[PDB]
């Protein structure tokens, strides 16, 4: 169905395949290095090739939606009240222990946020966490007061893709959180698709390592799905060229020659 748009998609597919492989050495193409994002609205003419990372998650902060010279940090622990793997309870016997608990919890959260901020990080990605609140509201307040964009509920399956894209090393304990594990990027902003949703695009990275994103848009869902399938077919064909460097004519010529 995307034949009138082929003038836009064919160079787009070729660029997408070339950007994720090394032409001089590649013997196969891992199509999982090309991420396809389907967003309703617009027209297939609006399909875009993003050289960075596109996340469908929403920014937790309100008022911070565009960071220039970003320093993205990926977190795999939780910014909430301390909680050990073993069963833990806090036993209160005096009135003073109540506000002591409150104050110490606040101090713990504040210290975590201060340690995060001291590294120069300004965009924070928090992996989705269960059994423990990944992002406490008090932690979100402290992060917002320190001018840091916060994105949470990052899927576990996407950690490898994110790290390969923006060059961020995941951090699982605050002790190992340092500046050298941050992924520098040119710009990280949340764009709006003309009332059809929002997208977080991190375009321009110091280490753009073999990963590209394709944004597919269309009037209705059916044509979007068909456009995704067609773009996948084009990528698979370029993959075939990569695997076997041989070209043959089309339009039934191989079949006629074979029959004769």
């Amino acid at each position: 169905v995307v034949s009138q748009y082929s003038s836009l998609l064919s160079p787009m597919s070729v660029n997408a395949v070339m950007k994720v492989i090394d032409p001089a050495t590649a013997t196969s193409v891992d199509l999982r290095d090309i991420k396809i994002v389907k967003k309703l609205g617009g027209t297939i003419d609006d399909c875009e090739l993003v050289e960075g990372l596109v996340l469908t998650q929403k920014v937790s902060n309100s008022g911070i939606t565009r960071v220039e010279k970003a320093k993205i940090g990926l977190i795999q622990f939780c910014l909430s009240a301390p909680k050990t793997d073993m069963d833990n309870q806090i036993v209160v016997s005096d009135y003073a222990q109540m506000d002591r608990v409150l104050r110490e919890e606040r101090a713990y959260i504040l210290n975590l946020v201060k340690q995060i901020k001291k590294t120069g990080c300004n965009v924070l990605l928090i992996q989705k966490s269960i059994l423990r609140d990944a992002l406490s509201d008090l932690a979100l307040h402290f992060l917002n007061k320190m001018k840091i964009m916060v994105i949470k509920d990052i899927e576990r399956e996407d950690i490898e893709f994110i790290c390969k894209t923006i060059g961020t090393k995941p951090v699982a304990h605050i002790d190992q959180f340092t500046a050298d594990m941050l992924g520098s990027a040119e710009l990280a902003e949340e764009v709006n698709l003309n009332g059809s949703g929002k997208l977080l695009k991190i375009t321009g990275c110091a280490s753009p390592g073999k990963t590209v994103t394709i944004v597919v848009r269309g009037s209705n869902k059916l044509v979007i799905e068909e456009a995704e399938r067609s773009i996948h077919d084009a990528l698979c064909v370029i993959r075939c060229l990569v695997k076997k460097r041989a070209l043959i004519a089309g339009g039934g010529a191989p079949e006629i020659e074979l029959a004769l």
């Binding site: 996948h232 077919d233 990528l235 698979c236 064909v237 075939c240």
Partner: peptide
């Protein structure tokens, strides 16, 4: 058809 999709894609 699935196998042809896997190996070639077209």
């Amino acid at each position: 058809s699935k196998a042809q999709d896997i190996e070639a894609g077209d």
